[PDB]
Amino acid sequence: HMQLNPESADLRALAKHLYDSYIKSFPLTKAKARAILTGKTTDKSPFVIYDMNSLMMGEDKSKEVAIRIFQGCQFRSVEAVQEITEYAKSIPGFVNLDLNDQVTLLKYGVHEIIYTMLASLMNKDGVLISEGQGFMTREFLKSLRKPFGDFMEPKFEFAVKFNALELDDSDLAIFIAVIILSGDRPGLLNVKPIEDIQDNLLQALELQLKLNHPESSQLFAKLLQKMTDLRQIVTEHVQLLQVIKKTEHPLLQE
């Protein structure tokens, strides 16, 4: 039977530490994204891009529409890798790992975290863009010419099922830490200390999900099954990017 003992209080302090660090690293949280999407915020109402005309008018608030949108997508990804790297530094034990392994964990991790957290900004209609100032519809993205039309669709399909788990920011802060500390990334030098951190993060995640979700007893198992489906999303995503690079950022340049 579950007890509030020293071990559980340390897992709760670890959960609080990751949450606090999550709030510092990521400007738009799920709590705020959900208040925007549900119209329960006093903050400015996002501009909706639902057709070509609203996109032209919206670019106000490269020659071809599909390629300008792909370029915004690519630049936001650079920013996202920086936020995730800043969060990774706050995970206890992470900065103590071989720097080469810190780089490998983030290199193979950031895409899975990007699509986990993008689900927070998605509903059935579309996705919040430019830190919650715009909203771009799923059907408008899907309307873009091949091969751009199918770029975001698998992320929406993932988000529909992922969002039905109803995770909050407290849940996601630990879940993203579990993803980063994956001992199975290729070319890791020293696996054991990564799995030791992951074990403690899995314990903290299980406890989090039991306290926070009284109505889904196997939510822990269900969340681990998703880390499996994120792999496949990232595979298809990398494949589509290779296709686009063969067929068609200020900080990168420096």
Binding site: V78, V81, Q82, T85, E86, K89, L99, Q102, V103, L106, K107, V110, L251, L252
Partner: peptide, 11 residues
């Protein structure tokens, strides 16, 4: 180029 961004952000 993913490594480039990560190494810089870790510094």
């Amino acid at each position: 180029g993913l490594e480039a961004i990560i190494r810089k952000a870790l510094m």
